[PDB]
Ligand binder design. Structure first.
Ligand SMILES: NC[C@H]1O[C@H](O[C@H]2[C@H](O)[C@@H](O[C@H]3O[C@H](CO)[C@@H](O)[C@H](N)[C@H]3O)[C@H](N)C[C@@H]2N)[C@H](N)[C@@H](O)[C@@H]1O
Ligand SMILES: NC[C@H]1O[C@H](O[C@H]2[C@H](O)[C@@H](O[C@H]3O[C@H](CO)[C@@H](O)[C@H](N)[C@H]3O)[C@H](N)C[C@@H]2N)[C@H](N)[C@@H](O)[C@@H]1O
Ligand SMILES: O=C(O)CNC(=O)C(=O)O
Ligand SMILES: O=C(O)CNC(=O)C(=O)O
Ligand code: NI
Ligand code: NI
Lengths: 282, 280
């Protein structure tokens, strides 16, 4: 793998929290990056006010998550599945219904694209290496087809090579040879080494405030958190309208601004609070 | 306009055939891949088709009594669900072993039925526009099937009584700007295709099952007979295609929810009001 000091130029667009929209040329580069590399890094998108509240909430809930009988874990120890809170005080339009994110997902997946994941990945100190996998599979074996889902990953602290910044395999999202994937979405070791020789994986620091948009079929893995502090990641995934997903449970207190929007969410609105503390753990 | 189902599209069975030998199954799949429509004659016992014909003719008055009669494109093509009472839900219709052998091979072991509906073609009906029942998932992209329509005629279909027009090989065609919001084929693309592979209509005897790609171009045509022409309609989808569940009474949960022939079903306490989301 290649270990970098910053997000690579070829994968990165630098914004401010004031940018509501990409100019046509920025949008073209964003789509060209997603088509060729299957991963896009957008720096400077979210205000620290929002990321601080979400970091605090998830660090505060972690003790109650680790206290459960069976802690929902992804592949190997230390990679915990944890939903951020769905209380109205911590549900922010700029996170759930971000205009730049939906501009990109509308262009790739269509105007009918919808968010169907409001979850997260808590990478604990001493965590193991995940096997290289995809979060969502190709819909037929041995077939080349366009994307049907884009993962939207929101780091809630500075991600470093120390504290478990995700390993990404650029260009891996279009690879679908026969016998390549197991029931858990893990890439066959033989196919990993063939690909590694042509386009090796990358890990890079990602500053808090950034958003990562990637093809849900991109090869990646969680890696060890070698720091003394949990590394919280907030996770969303936009799908084409026709992909079967369970709805996100939201309180009906946010129905007015969520269910209005032309930035769609597959949502079920509940009276009172939702118990957020797992179907998405593999 | 033919006198019988064409040889190239047809496999002749008896109601006793539970499963195709590998060579029969290969021919069935080769037909679905090339032509996108397969006709299986002699599959269902007249016992079953008579009960379903009678039930749907008996329910038609209650359908025509509705304020807005759910109609497909043009007058005379009525959307009508067959009953979901336990006495008229037959494993050999819902969970047919030959149908699911074919749909398991094309769509995978996880494929599920998500439609238990029907198409009642009334005497004096108009011509539907050529359309597909389910679209391609991306514009301008060639991709494999994700759904197979299972059409079960409940009387002998004739050129007179509105046997469906089918466009063989049309299931793989997805050129830019070809399809409207209703699934209708642009007339320009119809004429281009007509020159290469023109459409077919043929009689289909009751007891037959038609399996076709859900993307196959077809249309309802006028029923010029004195009698309504009932069609029972099912559609198998890949596990990952979003569909609403079929409402079934929990009295059939034991044998439906058991099966490795999957149904996207929601089981209800008591009876379901079957008399529309599938009318276009
Ligand atoms: N990047 C966001 C999240 O992505 C992954 O979760 C995914 C699952 O992977 C996916 O499941 C798919 O892959 C499974 C294993 O092959 C199959 O069982 C399943 N049928 C198949 O649809 C679900 N659809 C949705 C869920 N969000 C990670 N695990 C999770 O930690 C992370 O937060
Ligand atoms: N042979 C089975 C049946 O096929 C069609 O019913 C289909 C709909 O067509 C389809 O709708 C699709 O096409 C519409 C028009 O473009 C779109 O709105 C929609 N997004 C799109 O998924 C639904 N998903 C499922 C339904 N069973 C016919 N109408 C009906 O008479 C016939 O019995
Ligand atoms: O959290 C991360 O950095 C990566 N985690 C995963 O890829 C997962 O659990 O599926
Ligand atoms: O009933 C028929 O023969 C054909 N009908 C249709 O294609 C329809 O209404 O979608
Ligand atoms: Ni993952
Ligand atoms: Ni139709």
């Amino acid at each position: 793998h290649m270990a970098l000091a910053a997000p690579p130029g070829e994968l990165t667009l630098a914004l401010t929290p004031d940018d509501k929209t990409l100019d046509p040329a920025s949008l073209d580069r964003a789509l060209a990056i997603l088509a060729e590399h299957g991963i896009l890094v957008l720096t400077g998108m979210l205000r620290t006010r929002l990321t601080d509240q979400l970091r605090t909430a998830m660090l505060d809930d972690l003790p109650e998550v680790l206290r459960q009988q069976d802690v929902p874990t992804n592949f190997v120890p230390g990679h915990v599945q944890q939903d951020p809170p769905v209380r109205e005080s911590l549900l922010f339009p700029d996170v759930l219904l971000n205009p730049v994110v939906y501009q990109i997902t509308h262009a790739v997946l269509g105007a009918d694209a919808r968010n169907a994941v409001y979850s997260g990945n808590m990478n604990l100190p001493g965590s193991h290496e995940q096997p290289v996998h995809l979060d969502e599979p190709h819909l037929w074996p041995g077939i080349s087809h366009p994307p049907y889902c884009l993962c939207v990953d929101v780091p809630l602290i500075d991600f470093t090579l120390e504290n478990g910044s995700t390993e990404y395999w650029p260009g891996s999202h279009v690879l679908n040879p026969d016998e390549c994937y197991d029931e858990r979405g893990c890439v066959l070791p033989a196919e990993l080494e063939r690909r590694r020789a042509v386009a090796p994986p990358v890990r890079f620091p990602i500053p808090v405030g950034s958003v990562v948009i990637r093809d849900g079929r991109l090869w990646h893995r969680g890696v060890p958190n070698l720091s003394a502090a949990p590394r919280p990641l907030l996770a969303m995934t936009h799908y084409t309208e026709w992909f079967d997903m369970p709805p996100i449970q939201l309180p009906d207190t946010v129905k007015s601004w969520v269910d209005g929007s032309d930035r769609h969410t597959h949502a079920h609105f509940v009276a009172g609070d939702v118990d957020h503390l797992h179907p998405f753990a593999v």
